[PDB]
Every structure is written in structure tokens, then in C-alpha cells.
Design an enzyme around this catalytic site. Structure first.
Site, PDB file in Angstrom:
ATOM      1  N   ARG A  93     -26.615 -92.668  10.618  1.00  0.00           N
ATOM      2  CA  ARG A  93     -26.652 -93.303   9.263  1.00  0.00           C
ATOM      3  C   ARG A  93     -26.890 -94.707   9.498  1.00  0.00           C
ATOM      4  O   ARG A  93     -26.568 -95.498  10.470  1.00  0.00           O
ATOM      5  CB  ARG A  93     -25.039 -93.331   8.840  1.00  0.00           C
ATOM      6  CG  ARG A  93     -24.173 -93.769   9.976  1.00  0.00           C
ATOM      7  CD  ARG A  93     -22.700 -93.074   9.791  1.00  0.00           C
ATOM      8  NE  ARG A  93     -22.829 -91.739  10.128  1.00  0.00           N
ATOM      9  CZ  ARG A  93     -21.935 -90.786   9.521  1.00  0.00           C
ATOM     10  NH1 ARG A  93     -21.133 -91.283   8.532  1.00  0.00           N
ATOM     11  NH2 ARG A  93     -21.804 -89.494   9.830  1.00  0.00           N
ATOM     12  N   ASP A  98     -15.301 -97.144   6.780  1.00  0.00           N
ATOM     13  CA  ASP A  98     -14.225 -96.222   6.409  1.00  0.00           C
ATOM     14  C   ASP A  98     -13.072 -97.136   6.297  1.00  0.00           C
ATOM     15  O   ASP A  98     -12.890 -98.054   6.956  1.00  0.00           O
ATOM     16  CB  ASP A  98     -13.946 -95.492   7.796  1.00  0.00           C
ATOM     17  CG  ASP A  98     -14.804 -94.206   8.034  1.00  0.00           C
ATOM     18  OD1 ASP A  98     -15.780 -93.902   6.956  1.00  0.00           O
ATOM     19  OD2 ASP A  98     -14.864 -93.665   9.020  1.00  0.00           O
TER      20      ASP A  98
HETATM   21  N1  LIG Z   1     -10.234 -93.478   4.579  1.00  0.00           N
HETATM   22  C1  LIG Z   1     -11.376 -93.526   3.868  1.00  0.00           C
HETATM   23  N2  LIG Z   1     -12.412 -94.180   3.910  1.00  0.00           N
HETATM   24  C2  LIG Z   1     -13.777 -93.758   3.735  1.00  0.00           C
HETATM   25  N3  LIG Z   1     -13.980 -92.657   2.906  1.00  0.00           N
HETATM   26  C3  LIG Z   1     -13.149 -91.739   2.827  1.00  0.00           C
HETATM   27  C4  LIG Z   1     -11.634 -91.885   3.188  1.00  0.00           C
HETATM   28  N4  LIG Z   1     -11.092 -90.927   2.897  1.00  0.00           N
HETATM   29  C5  LIG Z   1     -11.665 -89.894   2.388  1.00  0.00           C
HETATM   30  N5  LIG Z   1     -13.096 -90.512   2.218  1.00  0.00           N
HETATM   31  C6  LIG Z   1     -14.042 -89.725   1.816  1.00  0.00           C
HETATM   32  O1  LIG Z   1     -14.892 -89.275   2.737  1.00  0.00           O
HETATM   33  C7  LIG Z   1     -16.045 -88.663   2.193  1.00  0.00           C
HETATM   34  C8  LIG Z   1     -17.132 -88.303   3.294  1.00  0.00           C
HETATM   35  O2  LIG Z   1     -17.492 -89.620   3.948  1.00  0.00           O
HETATM   36  P1  LIG Z   1     -18.394 -89.475   5.490  1.00  0.00           P
HETATM   37  O3  LIG Z   1     -18.804 -90.766   5.504  1.00  0.00           O
HETATM   38  O4  LIG Z   1     -19.453 -88.426   5.107  1.00  0.00           O
HETATM   39  C9  LIG Z   1     -17.373 -88.704   6.635  1.00  0.00           C
HETATM   40  P2  LIG Z   1     -17.531 -89.707   8.255  1.00  0.00           P
HETATM   41  O5  LIG Z   1     -17.195 -90.996   8.098  1.00  0.00           O
HETATM   42  O6  LIG Z   1     -19.005 -89.463   8.832  1.00  0.00           O
HETATM   43  O7  LIG Z   1     -16.654 -88.897   9.436  1.00  0.00           O
HETATM   44  P3  LIG Z   1     -15.069 -89.635   9.791  1.00  0.00           P
HETATM   45  O8  LIG Z   1     -14.193 -89.446   8.686  1.00  0.00           O
HETATM   46  O9  LIG Z   1     -14.743 -88.233  10.567  1.00  0.00           O
HETATM   47  O10 LIG Z   1     -15.282 -90.709  10.488  1.00  0.00           O
HETATM   48  C10 LIG Z   1     -16.370 -89.948   1.201  1.00  0.00           C
HETATM   49  O11 LIG Z   1     -17.134 -89.523   0.168  1.00  0.00           O
HETATM   50  C11 LIG Z   1     -15.125 -90.271   0.477  1.00  0.00           C
HETATM   51  O12 LIG Z   1     -14.631 -89.873  -0.679  1.00  0.00           O
HETATM   52  N1  LIG Z   2     -19.640 -94.128  17.946  1.00  0.00           N
HETATM   53  C1  LIG Z   2     -19.809 -93.795  16.790  1.00  0.00           C
HETATM   54  N2  LIG Z   2     -20.008 -92.324  16.408  1.00  0.00           N
HETATM   55  C2  LIG Z   2     -20.407 -91.865  15.350  1.00  0.00           C
HETATM   56  N3  LIG Z   2     -20.575 -90.632  14.982  1.00  0.00           N
HETATM   57  C3  LIG Z   2     -20.483 -90.421  13.604  1.00  0.00           C
HETATM   58  N4  LIG Z   2     -20.181 -91.608  13.117  1.00  0.00           N
HETATM   59  C4  LIG Z   2     -20.014 -92.580  14.142  1.00  0.00           C
HETATM   60  C5  LIG Z   2     -19.504 -93.873  14.209  1.00  0.00           C
HETATM   61  S1  LIG Z   2     -19.313 -94.946  12.901  1.00  0.00           S
HETATM   62  N5  LIG Z   2     -19.392 -94.448  15.448  1.00  0.00           N
HETATM   63 CA   LIG Z   3     -16.670 -92.495   9.992  1.00  0.00          CA
HETATM   64 CA   LIG Z   4     -17.242 -92.649   6.353  1.00  0.00          CA
END
Ligand SMILES: Nc1ncnc2c1ncn2[C@@H]1O[C@H](COP(=O)(O)CP(=O)(O)OP(=O)(O)O)[C@@H](O)[C@H]1O
Ligand SMILES: Nc1nc2[nH]cnc2c(=S)[nH]1
Ligand SMILES: [Ca+2]
Ligand SMILES: [Ca+2]
Ligand SMILES: [Ca+2]
Length: 159
Positions: A93, A98
Site C-alpha cells: 500500500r 491506523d
Molecule cells: N482503529 C482503526 N483505524 C483505522 N481503520 C479502522 C480502525 N478500526 C477499524 N477500521 C476500519 O478498517 C477498515 C479496513 O482497513 P485496512 O487498512 O484494509 C486493515 P489493515 O490496516 O491493512 O490491517 P490491520 O488493521 O491488521 O493493520 C477501514 O475501512 C476502517 O473502516
Molecule cells: N511492517 C508492516 N507490515 C505490514 N503488512 C501490512 N501492513 C503493514 C504495515 S503498515 N507495516
Molecule cells: Ca494497518
Molecule cells: Ca489500515
């Protein structure tokens, strides 16, 4: 105002440039001020490993926005920095923003779950957080310093 903590990640389209651009965009979020920016860390990928290393960092942002309003802005910034949804779980990405913490609030809406569900298991979230907020205590009373003292996380290298 409430202090929110935002985790930043990028592994596409020049991560250093993406993160510097995101920091400028975070500055333009209304009802909000950046308090502290962490160092930038080069981190191996979580999930699939057939992707480039990430730049990971953290920011402290004081805000009077509602939690979902802050999410509106972080999603907007991701999209405006060319983030495109692919099928692959945890795939590469241009930008990930987050919301790790929103003060001491525990939030469970359709769009937003805070604290971030996995942050206590990720050195690439906890180390930059400790750099900018070493005295942090989680909503459940757990101390950030105690987690980092007790649990094994791999050494994190600066970018
Ligand atoms: N604390 C938070 N911060 C950001 N997005 C959040 C969140 N809690 C829930 N979400 C939701 O998470 C959805 C999917 O986001 P993604 O970016 O695809 C998950 P990711 O960040 O790749 O995985 P991860 O949460 O395991 O790090 C968003 O569309 C949002 O609605
Ligand atoms: N280190 C790292 N690994 C990932 N895989 C999916 N998202 C991430 C982010 S943000 N950091
Ligand atoms: Ca993430
Ligand atoms: Ca995210
Ligand atoms: Ca602002």
C-alpha cells in the site's frame, strides 16, 4: 481536546515521500494539531512477505473531532495519496493510517475499533509509540513500558 495516536505505514511509491506527504496532510486536519512525530523505521512486512519492507512511524494528534470524524480524514488522506484496494490481505500500500488510540476511549462502531485490535503484538506500532509517549497507559490500565519490557519483539531499525 483528546490525544489520538496514529500509526503510519507505507511500502509503495517511495515510502519516505509518502510519509512526509502524509505528515503535511495530517497538519491540515481541522480541529486538530500534531503534537509529536516519531522516527521512521524500516520494518519487515507483516502478513504476506512477498512485498517490500515498510516505513513505519507514529504521530500524536490532539483533536476535538469525534473519533469517526478523525477516521473520515485519515481515510481521505490515504485515498488522496493514491491508495487502491486490492484483494490481498495485508498486501502492499502507498499509505496506511491506523487509529491506535483515541485518548482512553474504547470504541466499537461499524467503521472503527479502538484500541487497534493487534497493536499490543506489533513492535512496529509499539516502539514508535514509546518514542513519542513513553509514559503511555492503555485504556485497560496496561503500561506501554511494561509491555515493551516483558515481551519479545524483534529489534526495530531506523529508516
Ligand atoms: N482503529 C482503526 N483505524 C483505522 N481503520 C479502522 C480502525 N478500526 C477499524 N477500521 C476500519 O478498517 C477498515 C479496513 O482497513 P485496512 O487498512 O484494509 C486493515 P489493515 O490496516 O491493512 O490491517 P490491520 O488493521 O491488521 O493493520 C477501514 O475501512 C476502517 O473502516
Ligand atoms: N511492517 C508492516 N507490515 C505490514 N503488512 C501490512 N501492513 C503493514 C504495515 S503498515 N507495516
Ligand atoms: Ca494497518
Ligand atoms: Ca489500515
Ligand atoms: Ca489542524
Amino acid at each position: 481536546m483528546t490525544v489520538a495516536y496514529i500509526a503510519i505505514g507505507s511500502n509503495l511509491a517511495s515510502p519516505l515521500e509518502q510519509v512526509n506527504a502524509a505528515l503535511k496532510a495530517l497538519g491540515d486536519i481541522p480541529e486538530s494539531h500534531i503534537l509529536t512525530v516519531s522516527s521512521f523505521y524500516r520494518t519487515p512486512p507483516l502478513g504476506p512477505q512477498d512485498q517490500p519492507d515498510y516505513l513505519n512511524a507514529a504521530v500524536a494528534l490532539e483533536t476535538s473531532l469525534a473519533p469517526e470524524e478523525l477516521l473520515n480524514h485519515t481515510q481521505r488522506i490515504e485515498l488522496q495519496q493514491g491508495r487502491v484496494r486490492k484483494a490481498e490481505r495485508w498486501g502492499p500500500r502507498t499509505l496506511d493510517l491506523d487509529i491506535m488510540l483515541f485518548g482512553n476511549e474504547v470504541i466499537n462502531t461499524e467503521r472503527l475499533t479502538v484500541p487497534h485490535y493487534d497493536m499490543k503484538n506489533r513492535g512496529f506500532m509499539l516502539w514508535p509509540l514509546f518514542e513519542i509517549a513513553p509514559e503511555l497507559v492503555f485504556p485497560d490500565g496496561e503500561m506501554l513500558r511494561q509491555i515493551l519490557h516483558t515481551r519479545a519483539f524483534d529489534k526495530l531499525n531506523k529508516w
